[PDB]
Design an enzyme around this catalytic site. Structure first.
Site, PDB file in Angstrom:
ATOM      1  N   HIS A  41      -6.607 -33.193  40.573  1.00 28.02           N
ATOM      2  CA  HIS A  41      -7.923 -33.044  39.940  1.00 28.02           C
ATOM      3  C   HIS A  41      -7.901 -33.255  38.405  1.00 28.02           C
ATOM      4  O   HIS A  41      -8.965 -33.231  37.781  1.00 28.02           O
ATOM      5  CB  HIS A  41      -8.653 -31.756  40.327  1.00 28.02           C
ATOM      6  CG  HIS A  41      -8.117 -30.490  39.739  1.00 28.02           C
ATOM      7  ND1 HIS A  41      -7.407 -29.590  40.509  1.00 28.02           N
ATOM      8  CD2 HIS A  41      -8.262 -29.982  38.491  1.00 28.02           C
ATOM      9  CE1 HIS A  41      -7.136 -28.572  39.705  1.00 28.02           C
ATOM     10  NE2 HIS A  41      -7.625 -28.768  38.482  1.00 28.02           N
ATOM     11  N   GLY A 143      -7.504 -24.108  32.655  1.00 21.16           N
ATOM     12  CA  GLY A 143      -6.373 -24.705  31.955  1.00 21.16           C
ATOM     13  C   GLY A 143      -5.030 -24.291  32.537  1.00 21.16           C
ATOM     14  O   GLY A 143      -4.012 -24.922  32.237  1.00 21.16           O
ATOM     15  N   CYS A 145      -4.191 -24.628  35.653  1.00 15.98           N
ATOM     16  CA  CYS A 145      -3.818 -25.500  36.763  1.00 15.98           C
ATOM     17  C   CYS A 145      -2.515 -26.226  36.508  1.00 15.98           C
ATOM     18  O   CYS A 145      -2.157 -26.482  35.354  1.00 15.98           O
ATOM     19  CB  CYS A 145      -4.940 -26.456  37.136  1.00 15.98           C
ATOM     20  SG  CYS A 145      -6.515 -25.631  37.448  1.00 15.98           S
TER      21      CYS A 145
HETATM   22  C1  SQ2 Z   1     -11.451 -29.263  42.079  1.00 14.24           C
HETATM   23  C2  SQ2 Z   1     -11.806 -28.235  41.014  1.00 14.24           C
HETATM   24  C3  SQ2 Z   1     -12.138 -26.878  41.617  1.00 14.24           C
HETATM   25  C4  SQ2 Z   1     -12.469 -25.846  40.538  1.00 14.24           C
HETATM   26  N1  SQ2 Z   1     -11.384 -25.750  39.552  1.00 14.24           N
HETATM   27  C5  SQ2 Z   1     -10.766 -24.579  39.297  1.00 14.24           C
HETATM   28  O1  SQ2 Z   1     -11.052 -23.554  39.885  1.00 14.24           O
HETATM   29  C6  SQ2 Z   1      -9.673 -24.580  38.230  1.00 14.24           C
HETATM   30  N2  SQ2 Z   1      -9.248 -23.235  37.936  1.00 14.24           N
HETATM   31  N3  SQ2 Z   1      -8.071 -22.757  38.425  1.00 14.24           N
HETATM   32  N4  SQ2 Z   1      -7.941 -21.512  38.075  1.00 14.24           N
HETATM   33  C7  SQ2 Z   1      -9.045 -21.154  37.334  1.00 14.24           C
HETATM   34  C8  SQ2 Z   1      -9.386 -19.955  36.717  1.00 14.24           C
HETATM   35  C9  SQ2 Z   1     -10.566 -19.901  35.983  1.00 14.24           C
HETATM   36  C10 SQ2 Z   1     -11.395 -21.016  35.875  1.00 14.24           C
HETATM   37  C11 SQ2 Z   1     -11.079 -22.210  36.517  1.00 14.24           C
HETATM   38  C12 SQ2 Z   1      -9.884 -22.256  37.236  1.00 14.24           C
HETATM   39  C13 SQ2 Z   1     -11.043 -27.033  38.924  1.00 14.24           C
HETATM   40  C14 SQ2 Z   1     -10.698 -28.077  39.983  1.00 14.24           C
END
Ligand code: SQ2
Ligand code: SQ2
Lengths: 304, 304
Positions: A41, A143, A145
């Protein structure tokens, strides 16, 4: 003595963290040998994330669109491929700090350490478990990820998790290092509800053994039970059914303490039916289920 | 979202751990620049530990009696000195992996990470706090001595603790890196009782703010209190008295959530008087006091 929610030393994994930027999106990558692994992503704009066609989005990206920075230095990207939900970025330099490693897909109930990272830099390390509903209860902000979960056996790092998403319920979902999600989750910003978060019975029992080893004995009772009788109570309390495989894995803890596994099951049954009555076990007022029998043995023996 | 008992990444500290052997005793050392720091009780036989005269015992030791091994290689000891309860072993090689560092003596209530080590090798990392009675509740087995506690601000490691002992109650005591014990403890195998382990009120309040930030809001009530009224309740529950300094330090958490510090004190007062009623806050059934207001801010903002 003393028993803590301990994580593996993170040094070997810190040496692998890099920052990956594609377009306006920046997340973490894992640099092992001449390959950088990251959530696919990273190619998505915030709008793309609502309904992404990853194959179509990837066509518009070339090697030079993935900016990989390790510390303050840029890595040259000589290839890219998508494997399931992760991107593999071939770089022209092998990570000099690559530890001995394996990619392992863990089972629900298994624990691992997470090195939370932002912009390729580590913020902290904590221990967690793959829940029976295939979510993890981590601590991740936007961030984070690409942050990874791992276990360490002597000098070999077994990477088991890569962070991809947070569900609307505030729980976390991710993949193994082959890019396959744990559970039914998809990398799409769509409402995805988690299933029942049951308690990891074998881990609660291991933690009860850890408590006995460390002096907390008040919950030991005069009773025993059978696997079937215990499982009727476990079902009522949303605990995982205990099997002979779990009994076998608790064997060394049963042997060290001299408390038969089924006697400990009877103690747990009474704790489920009566509660703690305002009392604590190893500084906790609830039954802890994120220590495996292997974790209890390792911590209580001092494996390095 | 999500809130975990997170430790600092341990890599910078892993690069400093060494094994120190003197006679038949082996423990951990901290190698910074050309000096290796370790508990002075490494010169003690098990019998010496009952009533040691460290100055007299040290006379019988020469540089060649301290065996320092970093990984699989031996360091040459060219000098030794005793500073309070730690030994400083001057070696002929500066640690190439020495990070930027400071030696800091922390106050009770402050938190830090511990890298538990055995034979100069790391076993795990966990977060803990200096209790108001100057003990720590760690996870240490025999051989863990010389393991260190630390905090990290960007690239500077502030070492604050070195492990020396376990009290008969299963709690832990140690020194700062100048060899001064926290609290009244002495490095002698003699029964030393700890004082009242009071709850770190300012940390409980920071953790309540962390809970609000992460969605756990059920405990928010319609009340407020005063510092004096709150402190009458805190005294009754063995909580530390809250001061205006603590209120000031909670300011940013009060500002982010829009919940006045005294309103949060009133929520805490009700939780102390009524209990949790079988409910949980951030996966805990008791009030967590090992997160400082700085820890809550750092974790909730993603400082690397
Ligand atoms: C495909 C798409 C789905 C939604 N997304 C996420 O949830 C990324 N992410 N991961 N941990 C998080 C903690 C707080 C906020 C966002 C966060 C980005 C990628
Ligand atoms: C002076 C003398 C006092 C007694 N002592 C210790 O307690 C060392 N130690 N530290 N952590 C421990 C955990 C389990 C067992 C022993 C442990 C050795 C030094």
């Amino acid at each position: 003595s003393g028993f803590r929610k301990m994580a593996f030393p993170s040094g070997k994994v810190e040496g692998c963290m890099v920052q990956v930027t594609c377009g306006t999106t920046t997340l973490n990558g894992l640099w092992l040998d001449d390959v950088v692994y990251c959530p696919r992503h990273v190619i998505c704009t915030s709008e793309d994330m609502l309904n992404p066609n990853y194959e179509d989005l990837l066509i518009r990206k070339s090697n030079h669109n993935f900016l990989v920075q390790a510390g303050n230095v840029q890595l040259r990207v000589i290839g890219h491929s998508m494997q399931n939900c992760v991107l593999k970025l071939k770089v022209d330099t092998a990570n000099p700090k690559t530890p001995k490693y394996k990619f392992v897909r863990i089972q629900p109930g298994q624990t691992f350490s997470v090195l939370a990272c932002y912009n390729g830099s580590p913020s902290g390390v904590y221990q967690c478990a793959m829940r029976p509903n295939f979510t993890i209860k981590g601590s991740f902000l936007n961030g984070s990820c690409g942050s990874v979960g791992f276990n360490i056996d002597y000098d070999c790092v077994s990477f088991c998790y890569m962070h991809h998403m947070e569900l609307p319920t505030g729980v976390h979902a991710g993949t193994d290092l082959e890019g396959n999600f744990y559970g039914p989750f998809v990398d799409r910003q769509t409402a995805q509800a988690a299933g029942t978060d049951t308690t990891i019975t074998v881990n609660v029992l291991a933690w009860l053994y850890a408590a006995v080893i460390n002096g907390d004995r008040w919950f030991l009772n005069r009773f025993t039970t059978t696997l079937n009788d215990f499982n009727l109570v476990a079902m009522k309390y949303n605990y995982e059914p205990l099997t002979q495989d779990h009994v076998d894995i608790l064997g060394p803890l049963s042997a060290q303490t001299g408390i038969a596994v089924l006697d400990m099951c009877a103690s747990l049954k009474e704790l489920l039916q009566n509660g703690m009555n305002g009392r604590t076990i190893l500084g906790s007022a609830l039954l802890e289920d994120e220590f495996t029998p292997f974790d209890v043995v390792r911590q209580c023996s001092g494996v390095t």
